Amino acid sequence: VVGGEDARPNSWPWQVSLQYDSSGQWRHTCGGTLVDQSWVLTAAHCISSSRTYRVVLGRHSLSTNEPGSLAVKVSKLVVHQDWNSNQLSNGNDIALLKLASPVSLTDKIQLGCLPAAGTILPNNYVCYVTGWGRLQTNGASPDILQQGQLLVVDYATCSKPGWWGSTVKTNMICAGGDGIISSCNGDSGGPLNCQGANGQWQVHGIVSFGSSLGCNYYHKPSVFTRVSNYIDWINSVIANN
Ligand SMILES: *C(=O)[C@H](CC=C)[C@H]1CCC[C@@H]1O
């Protein structure tokens, strides 16, 4: 996250680290959200069928084995069937990962709540992106979970040709776009968290893409997969695997 700050420890208890095996080291590559005791939600672009995956849960520092943090092997990968890696701007950038065994819920490890089907956030809605990605474009990755505040930019604005133009579809969410705060490489797959009308935190987006001009860029909002578009698919995959 560029332009953000350290999260409070364990305050985003659904946030996952998605890691792969790199030459006998476990290496962070994407974020994710725990969405059921057996399933993590993430971005399809984070998945290669050739890598091997584990998920780390209940974490704050990526390098410290903190008490009550947990690594679990990932055993099944389910990418959205309409995802095309060669057409990232079509959307459908979504994947569900099955854990080898269910996690027990705790104070540090909780489920992230999804919005109703079809829910659209209005312009300037307040949300927060979280992750262990880069702190600036091509710069450092933190050890500690960051968060950053991002306001929703609605479709009508974000599709303008000064913004993303036609890169952006109604199956995505735009947030940010001031050039101060953004997601960045390494935040991919993790949550856009927005608090619903009754206090509750919900995960509305999955970090998908930013601009080749830079992670933080005026009138290039960070783009997210819109979770309220796949509620039905998420539940089918879970019932059927
Ligand atoms: C994820 O962190 C990145 C988007 C965030 C702004 C992805 C861009 C391509 C590589 C990475 O997976």
Describe the fold and architecture:
It is a single chain. With 241 residues, the chain is mainly beta. The chain has two domains: 1-12 and 112-228, Thrombin, subunit H; 13-111 and 229-241, Trypsin-like serine proteases (Thrombin, subunit H). Helix content is 6%, strand content 34%. It contains two helices and 13 strands. It has helices at 155-158, 231-240, and strands at residues 5-6, 15-22, 25-36, 39-42, 53-57, 70-79, 95-99, 126-131, 146-153, 172-175, 191-195, 201-209, 222-226. A six-stranded antiparallel β-barrel has the order 8-9-10-13-12-11. A hairpin with a 2-residue loop joins strand 2 (15-22) and strand 3 (25-36). The protein is globular. The termini are far apart. The relative contact order is 0.22. 2-(2-hydroxy-cyclopentyl)-pent-4-enal binds at residues 45, 133, 183-188, 207, 209-210, 215, 222. 2-(2-hydroxy-cyclopentyl)-pent-4-enal is lined by residues 45, 133, 183-188, 207, 209-210, 215, 222.
Topology of this protein?
Elements: E1 5-6, E2 15-22, E3 25-36, E4 39-42, E5 53-57, E6 70-79, E7 95-99, E8 126-131, E9 146-153, H1 155-158, E10 172-175, E11 191-195, E12 201-209, E13 222-226, H2 231-240
Antiparallel strand pairs: 1-9, 2-3, 2-5, 3-4, 4-7, 5-6, 6-7, 8-9, 8-11, 9-10, 10-13, 11-12, 12-13
The protein binds 2-(2-hydroxy-cyclopentyl)-pent-4-enal.
